[PDB]
C-alpha cells in the first residue's frame, strides 16, 4: 500500500536505454552550462576592468581640471604684468597654450564616453548570460534527478555495475 | 609604433604634447621635456628638473609619484600617457609604499577607502599598525636575529664519515679545499678556514652556499643541512663562502540581549536586478544557521511573479527568540524560480551575520548583493557554507533588500565573556556508555554526551570536537555552559586543533582555542600546512580574526613563510569572494615586510612579461611552425625591457634560489595545449650544478597539481622522519595568478614514453647514464622512488598513470607529473605495478626474489607510516574543501582517503588487504603488457 515510482519504461533493457539517453542528455546540458559559466565569469572580470578604467579616466580628467584651475590662477599675475610691458605676444602665447590644453580635455572626455557606452552594453550581456543560465538550470536539475532515479531503479532490480557503466560511460 | 605621444602638465598651467620612446626611462623623458619647455611660456619661473617628480594615473586608477626615474615608461604603464610635474614634497616613504602595494597586490588601495566600511577601516588601522611595529622592532635587533628572519635554516628531518669542502671569502679568487667530518657544527668549520696563514674571529662570520641565499649556521651538525646532505649523496664538494657580520648589516639596512525574548524576524522589502523566465514566479526561501546545522526551521515567501524588480513587503518570522541567537548566527537567503503550483530553479543566494564585528546585533536596512547559485549534487535549499561577504559587482549583480527590525531604544550587543562565564557556572553505567561512543577504534548519544559534558573535559579532552557538535547552539543556556568549559579546557595537540578550524566550528572562542594550540607549531611544520590555513580564511565571518593575526605573526617572524603566504593570497585576488579579505592581509603583510616587497615586485614584473611572452607564442603557434616561433620568442626576449625584467630575480618557487642570467638560446616552449614556456637560467657565482629552470604555465589551473605535490612532499617528510628516504622528487609548484603559475624544471630527465620510443630501453637508458659501478646505485634509486610514488598515487587515488606522465632522472629516481585527477574522480583506483618497473627493479632478470622482496618491504613500510598519520591527512583534506576544487568537494571525496588507508580496519587487517592488493597488481602486470 505504498507508491512512489516515476520511471517511464518497464523492461530492464528498456529502462537501461532511457538511462543511456538521459545521461547523454545530461552531460550535453552540463557542457552548455559550463560554457555559459565561463562567459559569466569572463564578463564579470571584463566589466570590473572597464569600471576601474572609468575611474582611471575620472582621475585623469580630475588632473586636467586642476591644471585648468592652476592656469587661471597663475596667469592672472603675468597677463597684467606683460600688458603694462606692451607684450601682447607673451599674453597670446599663454592663451593659445591654454586653448590647446582644453582641446585635449575634450578628447579624453570623448574616450571616457565611448567606454561608458561599452560598459553599458557588456552590463546587458552579463544580464542576458545570467538569464540563459537561469533558464538552463531547471532542465539541468531535471535531467540529473531523472538520471539518478533510473540508476536506483536498475540497482534495485539487481543489474550489475558493468551493465550500468556501459550505459553511463558512453 | 615605437614612440608614444605624451601629455606634459607643467606646474605653471602650461601644456606640452610631444612624442617619446616607450623604452625611454623617466630621467631621459625629463631632459627632453626641459629642452622643449625652454621654448614655451613661463619657463623662467620653473625650478630645475631635479626639484620635481613626474606623476601619472597608474593601471589600478591611482596617482603615483614616480620616484624611481631609472624606470622605463613602458614599465610604468600609465593609464593614458599623461605626466604631471609636482613638488618633491611631503613624506616620500608613505606615498611610495602605498603606490607599490597597489601594483603588487593587483588592487588599488583606494578601492578599500571607497567601500566606506568601518570593518575594513578598523582592520587596516589595526593590522598596518601591528605589522609596522613588528617591522620596526625587527630592524633594531642584530645580525643573528636578522639572518634567521631572512634566510632561515633549511634542514633535513645515521653514519659519521668525512669528506672535503671548498671554502673561500667574499671578494676573492683563491679558494681552500680541506677535510671536515659530517657531524661537525658550523661554528668549528669556520675557524678551520679562518686559519689562513697561521686577525679575525670566526664568531663574527657565517657560511653561505654561493650562488644562493642559503646559509649554514646555528647549533646543528653539517649533515642535517639540505645543501651538505644533497652534496654527500650525489658525491660533490660543498662550495661555500665566508661572509662578515658587517656584510649582513649591509643587507639589513633598509626601512540586555538575554532580556529580549521576542521572536526573531525580518522584513523582506524588495528584489533588484533579477534575471529569470517571465512565465514563472519568484520565491525567497530563508533560514538561520550556525555552522552546518540549522538554528530553526526554514520559512518561505509568497509567489510574487517574475520581473526585474520583484516586491514582497512581507514579515518573515522564525521559530527562535532574539535572546537565543548565538554570536555567529547566520541568516541565509536563496532566491528561487518556482512554477505557480496549480498542478525548482535556484537563482542566487546571500548570507549575512546577524551580529556585526563589534558584537552589535544589526538593525535597519541592508542591501544583500546576491551570488548566483551554481547547481551541484546535493541540491540543498540554502548555501550556509558560502561567504558572508557581499558581491563586489554592485552595478550589475542581483540584490535583495531587507530590513532588520528595531529591538530596543539603545543598541543591543552580545554579552561579554564575564557575563557568559557568570551564567556558564551553573562504577557508573554512564561512564561505560560514554567511553563506548568516544573510544571508537545520533540524538540518544548527543543527549548523553551533553549530560556528561564535564566528564568529557576531565577524561576525554581530545573529544571536544564531538562535544561542540552535540551542543544545542539555538539555546543561549547551552551555549553559555559549553563556552564555560572551553575557557578552562586543556591544550590539545596540533592534530586536534586542525580539526577545530573546519567550518563546523564557527564560534570565535573555538577558533581562538584552535589557534592557541597551533602556536606550538615550528616554521617547518607550519609551512607544511600553510596552503590549508590560507583556505580556512574563506570560512571566516569577519575580517579581523585570530587566524589572520596568527598568519601575519608567523609571516613577519619568517621571510619564507611571508613569501608563500604572499603568493597563496596573491594567486586568488582575481576571485571576487576573497579579493577584499585577501587584499587587506596582503597590504598589512607588505607594510611589515618592505624589504621582501622589493623582491616580490621584481618577480611580479617577470611574471607580467612571461604572460605577454606566452600570449605571443600562443598566437604565433597557430600562424607559423615551431622553429620560427622559437626565434620570434627570442627576439621579444632580447628586448631591453624584457631581458632586464626576466633577469636577476629570486625564484618565486624557492626564494633562496637565484635566477640571474636568462640563457635565451636554451629558452623555448613545451608542446602542450597552453604552450608553457621553458625558461632557463645560469649563475656563474653558483656551485657545481649551477643551472636552474622554470616552466611558466598560463591557461590551465595548477591548484590541483600543487595540492597533490604538497601531499607527496608531506609523505616524503613523514617517511624521512621515520628514517626512510624514498628518494622522492618534490619539485616546486606555485600558483601566481589567474590560471597562471610556475613549475620547477627537473633537469637531466625525460618521460618514460620518450625513453622507450628511442631489448628493454628503460634498463638500457639507465646503463648509458650510470656506467659500471654507478648502475647498482641507479636501480636502488629507481626501486626506492618507484615504491614511494606507487604508495602515494594509490593512497591519493591518482588514476591515468601512463608513460607520457611518469618521468625518470639520470640518477635512477622515478617521479610523476600532470596530476589532473585524484581521489578516484574523473571508482577506486587499484594499486599499480608495471612490468617495466618490475623488470628494472629485478636488475633485468626473470626472478630476483631477493631484490623484489626489499621493494615489497618499502611499499609496505611506506603504507604503514601514512596510516599512523592518517588523521593528519583527513583533517588537512577536510579544510581543503574550502578551495572549491571539483574533485575535493564533499565527504565522499574525504571518505576515499579513509578507505585507501584502511582507518576503519585494524593495523594488521590493513597489512593483509594491502598485500592482497599488492599481489593482484603483480598478477595484472603481466596481462597489461600483452
Ligand atoms: N613533454 C613533456 C614534459 C613535461 N614536463 C616535464 C617536467 C615536469 C616537471 C619538472 N620538470 C620537467 N618535462 C617534460 N619533458 C619533455 C622533454 C624532456 C622533459 C623536458 N623536455 C623538453 C624541454 C623543453 C622543450 C620541450 Cl618541447 C621538451
Dihedral sign for Cα A66, A71, A74, A76, please.
negative
- With CA atoms as reference, report the closest residue to B694 among B668, B729, B726: B668
Q: Report angle CA B845, B850, B856 to the nearest 5 degrees.
A: 100
Is the distance from CB of B25 to CB of A25 less than 8 angstroms?
Answer: no
Is the distance from CB of B682 to CB of B661 less than 8 angstroms?
Answer: yes
- With CA atoms as reference, report the closest residue to B537 among B127, B130, B891, B882: B882
Cell of B444: 540518544
Q: Which of B730, B803, B807 to mutate to test the pocket of ligand 1 (most atoms within 8 A of CB)?
A: B807
Q: Which residues contact B652 (CB under 8 A, 6 or more apart)?
A: B567, B603, B607, B734, B736, B742
Q: Which residues contact B86 (CB under 8 A, 6 or more apart)?
A: B11, B52, B53, B55, B65
CB contact under 8 A, A68 and B13: yes
Strands B82-87 and B3-9: parallel
- With CA atoms as reference, report the closest residue to B37 among A93, A69, A149: A93
3-class secondary-structure state, position B243: strand
CA distance B596 to B254: 11
Is the distance from CB of A33 to CB of A140 less than 8 angstroms?
Answer: yes
- With CA atoms as reference, report the closest residue to B171 among B241, B99, B274: B241
Cell of B887: 574533485
Q: Please give the number of the atom of ligand 1 that sits closest to the Cα of B672.
A: 1
Pick B417-598's CATH classification: 1.25.40.70, 3.40.640.10, 3.10.110.10, 3.10.580.10: 1.25.40.70
Breaks in chain A after (C-N > 2.5 angstroms): none
In this structure, what are the phi and psi dihedrals at residue B277, rounded to the nearest 5 degrees?
-75, 130
DSSP B602-651: HHHHHHHHHHHHHHHHHHHHHHS-HHHHHHHHHHHHHSHHHHHHHSSEE-
Cell of B252: 639589513
CA distances B104 to B251, B449, B571, Å, are 22, 51, 11
3-class secondary-structure state, position B704: helix
CA distance B754 to A170: 31
Is the distance from CB of B25 to CB of B70 less than 8 angstroms?
Answer: yes
Expressed as residue numbers, the domain containing A56 is 1-170
Q: Report angle CA B439, B479, B431 to the nearest 5 degrees.
A: 25
- Among residues 75-94 of chain A, which lie with CB inside 8 Å of chain B? 75, 78, 90, 93-94
Is the distance from CB of B799 to CB of B821 less than 8 angstroms?
Answer: yes
- With CA atoms as reference, report the closest residue to B8 among B77, B69, B82: B82
CB contact under 8 A, B15 and A104: yes
Is the distance from CB of B788 to CB of B853 less than 8 angstroms?
Answer: no
CA distances B374 to B289, B349, B699, B890, Å, are 20, 10, 22, 15
Sheet with B52-57, edge to edge strand ranges:
B15-21, B3-9, B82-87, B52-57, B63-65
CB contact under 8 A, B393 and A64: no
Is the distance from CB of B319 to CB of B297 less than 8 angstroms?
Answer: yes
> B623: CA distance to ligand 1 center in Å?
23
CA distance B537 to B501: 10
Residue B391 DSSP label:
P
Q: Is B510 exposed, middle or buried (0-12, 13-18, 19+ CB in 10 A)?
A: buried
Top CATH class of B263-404 equals mainly beta
Chain B hits for A75, CB-CB cut-off 8 Å, are: 13
Domain count, chain A: 1
Report how far apart the first and last C-alpha atoms of chain B are (Å, whole number): 61
For chain A, how big is the Rg over CA atoms in Å?
Answer: 34
SS (H, E, C) B515-576: HHHHCCCCHHHHHHHHHHHHHHHHHCCCCCCHHHHHHHHHHHHCHHHHHHHHHHHHCCCCCH
Q: Is B95 exposed, middle or buried (0-12, 13-18, 19+ CB in 10 A)?
A: middle
Is the distance from CB of B546 to CB of B511 less than 8 angstroms?
Answer: yes
Cell of B400: 535583495
Strands B82-87 and B649-650: unpaired
Name the strand (E) or helix (H) holding B590.
helix B576-591
CA distances A158 to A7, A12, B650, B907, Å, are 16, 10, 61, 34
Beta bridge partners of B267: B315, B403
CA distance B344 to B557: 52
Cell of B75: 614599465
CA distances B569 to B143, B387, B564, B574, B739, Å, are 30, 17, 8, 10, 14
Dihedral sign for Cα B768, B773, B775, B778, please.
negative
CA distance B104 to B451: 54
Is the distance from CB of B296 to CB of B287 less than 8 angstroms?
Answer: yes
- With CA atoms as reference, report the closest residue to B506 among B335, B285, B296, B295: B295
Beta bridge partners of B8: B16, B83
CA distance A75 to A91: 9
Strands B205-208 and B215-216: antiparallel
3-class secondary-structure state, position B815: strand
Q: Report angle CA B648, B652, B657 to the nearest 5 degrees.
A: 60
3-class secondary-structure state, position B181: strand
Is the distance from CB of B750 to CB of B811 less than 8 angstroms?
Answer: no
H helices present in chain A, as ranges: 12-84, 88-156, 161-168
- Greatest Cα-to-Cα distance within chain B, rounded to the nearest angstrom: 103
CA distance B476 to B23: 67
- With CA atoms as reference, report the closest residue to B225 among B150, B151, B156, B161: B156
Q: Where are the beta strands (DSSP E) in B49-134?
A: 52-57, 63-65, 82-87
Q: Report angle CA A87, A89, A95 to the nearest 5 degrees.
A: 115
> B211: CA distance to ligand 1 center in Å?
25
- Closest CA–CA distance from residue A138 to any residue of chain B (Å): 5
Q: Is A140 exposed, middle or buried (0-12, 13-18, 19+ CB in 10 A)?
A: middle
Chain A hits for B57, CB-CB cut-off 8 Å, are: 56, 59-60, 63
H helices present in B316-452, as ranges: 417-424, 429-438, 443-451
Cell of A74: 597663475
CA distance B24 to B641: 10
CA distance B879 to B877: 5
CA dihedral B499, B501, B503, B509 (to 10 degrees): 120
Is the distance from CB of A136 to CB of B80 less than 8 angstroms?
Answer: no
Beta bridge partners of B17: B7
CA distance B853 to B595: 53
Q: Whose CA is nearest to atom 17 of ligand 1?
A: B750
- Interface list for chain B against chain A, based on CB atoms closer than 8 Å: 7, 9, 11-15, 17, 40-42, 55, 57, 59-63, 79-80, 82, 84, 108, 273, 275-277, 337, 344-347, 372-375, 379, 392-393, 395-396, 398, 574, 576, 738
CA distance B286 to B297: 9
CA distance A144 to A148: 6
Quickly count: other Cβ atoms within 10 Å of residue B400's Cβ: 26
CA distance B867 to B877: 15
- With CA atoms as reference, report the closest residue to B597 among B650, B526, B662, B529: B650
Q: Which residues contact A146 (CB under 8 A, 6 or more apart)?
A: A22
Q: Please give the number of the atom of ligand 1 that sits closest to the Cα of B817.
A: 8
CA–chain centroid gap for B701, Å, is: 14
Q: Which residues contact A79 (CB under 8 A, 6 or more apart)?
A: A91, A94
CA distance B870 to B873: 5
H helices present in B195-263, as ranges: 226-234, 245-252
**Technique used:** X-ray
DSSP B292-320: SSBSS--EE---EEP-SS-EEEEEEEEEE
CA distance B829 to B596: 44
Beta bridge partners of B333: B286, B350
Q: Which residues contact B594 (CB under 8 A, 6 or more apart)?
A: B97, B135, B254, B255
Strands B52-57 and B63-65: antiparallel
Cell of B256: 540586555
Is the distance from CB of B79 to CB of B61 less than 8 angstroms?
Answer: yes
Beta bridge partners of B281: B305, B338
- Among B5, B6, B10, B14, most A C-beta atoms within 10 A, so best to mutate, is B14
Q: Is A57 on the interface with B (CB under 8 A)?
A: yes
Q: Report angle CA B854, B857, B859 to the nearest 5 degrees.
A: 115
Cell of A10: 518497464
SS (H, E, C) B352-380: EECECCCCEECCEEEEEECEECCCCCCCC
CA distance B117 to B490: 38
Is the distance from CB of B922 to CB of B833 less than 8 angstroms?
Answer: yes
- With CA atoms as reference, report the closest residue to B241 among B196, B265, B207: B207
CA distance B708 to B897: 13
3-class secondary-structure state, position A90: helix
Is the distance from CB of B243 to CB of B205 less than 8 angstroms?
Answer: yes
3-class secondary-structure state, position B584: helix
> B608: CA distance to ligand 1 center in Å?
23
Report how far apart the first and last C-alpha atoms of chain A are (Å, whole number): 38
CB contact under 8 A, B57 and A63: yes
Is the distance from CB of B371 to CB of B349 less than 8 angstroms?
Answer: yes
Is the distance from CB of B888 to CB of B816 less than 8 angstroms?
Answer: no
> B702: CA distance to ligand 1 center in Å?
16
CA distance B257 to B755: 73
CA distance B706 to B683: 27
Q: Whose CA is nearest to atom 16 of ligand 1?
A: B750
> B756: CA distance to ligand 1 center in Å?
15
Is the distance from CB of B468 to CB of B499 less than 8 angstroms?
Answer: no
Q: Which residue of A has its CA nearest to B78?
A: A56
- Closest CA–CA distance from residue B852 to any residue of chain A (Å): 34
CB contact under 8 A, B344 and A138: yes
Give the CB-side neighbour count of residue A22, counting CA atoms within 13 A: 22
> B749: CA distance to ligand 1 center in Å?
8
Q: Which residue has the cell 525567497?
A: B284
Is the distance from CB of B317 to CB of B263 less than 8 angstroms?
Answer: yes
CA dihedral B477, B482, B488, B494 (to 10 degrees): -160
Chain B hits for A127, CB-CB cut-off 8 Å, are: 273, 275, 396
Cell of B600: 616580490
Q: Is the CB of B753 under 6 A from ligand 1?
A: no
Q: Which residue has the cell 587515488?
A: B797
CB contact under 8 A, A45 and B379: no
CA distance B390 to B290: 19
Q: Which residues contact A59 (CB under 8 A, 6 or more apart)?
A: B57, B61, B62, B63, B79
Q: Which residues contact B754 (CB under 8 A, 6 or more apart)?
A: none
CB contact under 8 A, B345 and A134: yes
> B729: CA distance to ligand 1 center in Å?
15
Would you say how long chain A is, in residues?
A: 170
Is the distance from CB of B214 to CB of B154 less than 8 angstroms?
Answer: yes
Amino acid at each position: 500500500y505504498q507508491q512512489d515510482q516515476v520511471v517511464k519504461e518497464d523492461n530492464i533493457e528498456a529502462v537501461g536505454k532511457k538511462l543511456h539517453e538521459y545521461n547523454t542528455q545530461f552531460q550535453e546540458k552540463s557542457r552548455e552550462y559550463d560554457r555559459l559559466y565561463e562567459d559569466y565569469t569572463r564578463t564579470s572580470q571584463e566589466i570590473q576592468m572597464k569600471r576601474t578604467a572609468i575611474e582611471a579616466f575620472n582621475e585623469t580628467i580630475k588632473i586636467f581640471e586642476e591644471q585648468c584651475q592652476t592656469q587661471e590662477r597663475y596667469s592672472k599675475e603675468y597677463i597684467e604684468k606683460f600688458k603694462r610691458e606692451g607684450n601682447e605676444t607673451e599674453i597670446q602665447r599663454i592663451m593659445h597654450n591654454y586653448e590647446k590644453l582644453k582641446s585635449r580635455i575634450s578628447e579624453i572626455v570623448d574616450s571616457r564616453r565611448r567606454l561608458e557606452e561599452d560598459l553599458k552594453k557588456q552590463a546587458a550581456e552579463y544580464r542576458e548570460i545570467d538569464k540563459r543560465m537561469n533558464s538552463i538550470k531547471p532542465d539541468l536539475i531535471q535531467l540529473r534527478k531523472t538520471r539518478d532515479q533510473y540508476l536506483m531503479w536498475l540497482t534495485q532490480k539487481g543489474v550489475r555495475q558493468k551493465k550500468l557503466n556501459e550505459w553511463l560511460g558512453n | 609604433n615605437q614612440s608614444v605621444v605624451v601629455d606634459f602638465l607643467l606646474p605653471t598651467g602650461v601644456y606640452l604634447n610631444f612624442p617619446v620612446s616607450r623604452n625611454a626611462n623617466l630621467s631621459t623623458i625629463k631632459q627632453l621635456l626641459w629642452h622643449r619647455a625652454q621654448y614655451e611660456p613661463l619657463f623662467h619661473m620653473l625650478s630645475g628638473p631635479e626639484a620635481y617628480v613626474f606623476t601619472c594615473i597608474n593601471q589600478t586608477a591611482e596617482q603615483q609619484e614616480l620616484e624611481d626615474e631609472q624606470r622605463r615608461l613602458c614599465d610604468v604603464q600609465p593609464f593614458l600617457p599623461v605626466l604631471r610635474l609636482v613638488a618633491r614634497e611631503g613624506d616620500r616613504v608613505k606615498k611610495l609604499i602605498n603606490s607599490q602595494i597597489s601594483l603588487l597586490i593587483g588592487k588599488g588601495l583606494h578601492e578599500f577607502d571607497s567601500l566606506c566600511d568601518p570593518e575594513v577601516n578598523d582592520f587596516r588601522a589595526k593590522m598596518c599598525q601591528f605589522c609596522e611595529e613588528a617591522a620596526a622592532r625587527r630592524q633594531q635587533l642584530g645580525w643573528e636575529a636578522w639572518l634567521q628572519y631572512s634566510f632561515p635554516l633549511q634542514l633535513e628531518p645515521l653514519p659519521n664519515r668525512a669528506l672535503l669542502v671548498n671554502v673561500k671569502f667574499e671578494g676573492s679568487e683563491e679558494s681552500f679545499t680541506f677535510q671536515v667530518s659530517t657531524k661537525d657544527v658550523p661554528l668549528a668549520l669556520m675557524a678551520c678556514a679562518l686559519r689562513k696563514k697561521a686577525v679575525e674571529q670566526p664568531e663574527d662570520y657565517t657560511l653561505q652556499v654561493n650562488g644562493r641565499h642559503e646559509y649554514l649556521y646555528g647549533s646543528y651538525p653539517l649533515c642535517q643541512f639540505q645543501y651538505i646532505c644533497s652534496c654527500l649523496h650525489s658525491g660533490l664538494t660543498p662550495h661555500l663562502t665566508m661572509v662578515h657580520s658587517s656584510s649582513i648589516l649591509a643587507m639589513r639596512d633598509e626601512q540586555s540581549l538575554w532580556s529580549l525574548e521576542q521572536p526573531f524576524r525580518i522584513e523582506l522589502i524588495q528584489g533588484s536586478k533579477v534575471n529569470a523566465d517571465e512565465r514563472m514566479k519568484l520565491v525567497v526561501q530563508a533560514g538561520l544557521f550556525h555552522g552546518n546545522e540549522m538554528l530553526c526551521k526554514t520559512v518561505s515567501s509568497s509567489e510574487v511573479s517574475v520581473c526585474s524588480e520583484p516586491v514582497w513587503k512581507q514579515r518573515l518570522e522564525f521559530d527562535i527568540n532574539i535572546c537565543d541567537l548565538p554570536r555567529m548566527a547566520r541568516l541565509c537567503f536563496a532566491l528561487y524560480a518556482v512554477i505557480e503550483k496549480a498542478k525548482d530553479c535556484p537563482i542566487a543566494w546571500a548570507n549575512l551575520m546577524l551580529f556585526d564585528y563589534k558584537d552589535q546585533l544589526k538593525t535597519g536596512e541592508r542591501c544583500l548583493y546576491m551570488w548566483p547559485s551554481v547547481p551541484d549534487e546535493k541540491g540543498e535549499l540554502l548555501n550556509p557554507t558560502g561567504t558572508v561577504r557581499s558581491n563586489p559587482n554592485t552595478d550589475s549583480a542581483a540584490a535583495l533588500l531587507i530590513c532588520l527590525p528595531e529591538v530596543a531604544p539603545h543598541p543591543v550587543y552580545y554579552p561579554a565573556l564575564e557575563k557568559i562565564l557568570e551564567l556558564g557556572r551553573h562504577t557508573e553505567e554512564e561512564q561505560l556508555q560514554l567511553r563506548e561512543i568516544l573510544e571508537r577504534r545520533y540524538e540518544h548519544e548527543k543527549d548523553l554526551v551533553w549530560k556528561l559534558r564535564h566528564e568529557v573535559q576531565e577524561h576525554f579532552p581530545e573529544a571536544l570536537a564531538r562535544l561542540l557538535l552535540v551542543t544545542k547552539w539555538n539555546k543561549h543556556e547551552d551555549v553559555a555552559q559549553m563556552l564555560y568549559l572551553l575557557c578552562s579546557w586543556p591544550e590539545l595537540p596540533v592534530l586536534s586543533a586542525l580539526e577545530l578550524l573546519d567550518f563546523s566550528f564557527p564560534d570565535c572562542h573555538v577558533g581562538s582555542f584552535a589557534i592557541k594550540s597551533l602556536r606550538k607549531l615550528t616554521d617547518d611544520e607550519l609551512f607544511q600546512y600553510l596552503l590549508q590555513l590560507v583556505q580556512v580564511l574563506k570560512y571566516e565571518s569577519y575580517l579581523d580574526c585570530e587566524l589572520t593575526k596568527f598568519l601575519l605573526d608567523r609571516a613577519l617572524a619568517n621571510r619564507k613563510i611571508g613569501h608563500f603566504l604572499f603568493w597563496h593570497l596573491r594567486s586568488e585576488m582575481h576571485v571576487p569572494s576573497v579579493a577584499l579579505r585577501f587584499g587587506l592581509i596582503l597590504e598589512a603583510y607588505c607594510r611589515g615586510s618592505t624589504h621582501h616587497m622589493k623582491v616580490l615586485m621584481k618577480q611580479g614584473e617577470a611574471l607580467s612579461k612571461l604572460k605577454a611572452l606566452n600570449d605571443f607564442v600562443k598566437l604565433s603557434s597557430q600562424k607559423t611552425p615551431k622553429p620560427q616561433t622559437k626565434e620570434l620568442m627570442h627576439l621579444c626576449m632580447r628586448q631591453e625591457a624584457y631581458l632586464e625584467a626576466l633577469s636577476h630575480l629570486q625564484s618565486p618557487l624557492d626564494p633562496s634560489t637565484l635566477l640571474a642570467e636568462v640563457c635565451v638560446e636554451q629558452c623555448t616552449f613545451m608542446d602542450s595545449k597552453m604552450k608553457p614556456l621553458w625558461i632557463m637560467y645560469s649563475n656563474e657565482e653558483a656551485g657545481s650544478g649551477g643551472s636552474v629552470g622554470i616552466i611558466f604555465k598560463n591557461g590551465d589551473d595548477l591548484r590541483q597539481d600543487m595540492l597533490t605535490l604538497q601531499m607527496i612532499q608531506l609523505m616524503d617528510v613523514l617517511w624521512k622522519q621515520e628514517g626512510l628516504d624514498l628518494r622522492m622528487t618534490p619539485y616546486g609548484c606555485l600558483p601566481t595568478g589567474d590560471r597562471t603559475g610556475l613549475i620547477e624544471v627537473v633537469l637531466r630527465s625525460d618521460t618514460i614514453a620518450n625513453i622507450q620510443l628511442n631489448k628493454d630501453a628503460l634498463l638500457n637508458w639507465l646503463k648509458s647514464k650510470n656506467p659500471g659501478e654507478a648502475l647498482d646505485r641507479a636501480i636502488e634509486e629507481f626501486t626506492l622512488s618507484c615504491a614511494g610514488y606507487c604508495v602515494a598515487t594509490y593512497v591519493l587515488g591518482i588514476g591515468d598513470r601512463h608513460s607520457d606522465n611518469i618521468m625518470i632522472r639520470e640518477s635512477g629516481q622515478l617521479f610523476h607529473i600532470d596530476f589532473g585527477h585524484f581521489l578516484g574522480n574523473f571508482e577506486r583506483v587499484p594499486f599499480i605495478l608495471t612490468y617495466d618497473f618490475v623488470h628494472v627493479i629485478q636488475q633485468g632478470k626473470t626472478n630476483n626474489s631477493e631484490k623484489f622482496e626489499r621493494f615489497r618491504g618499502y611499499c609496505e613500510r611506506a603504507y604503514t607510516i601514512l596510516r599512523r598519520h592518517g588523521l593528519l591527512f583527513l583533517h588537512l583534506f577536510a579544510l581543503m574543501r574550502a578551495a572549491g576544487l571539483p574533485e575535493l568537494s564533499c565527504s565522499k571525496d574525504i571518505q576515499y582517503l579513509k578507505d585507501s588507508l584502511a582507518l576503519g580496519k585494524t593495523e594488521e587487517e590493513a597489512l593483509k588487504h594491502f598485500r592482497v592488493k599488492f599481489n593482484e597488481a603483480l598478477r595484472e602486470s603481466w596481462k597489461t603488457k600483452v
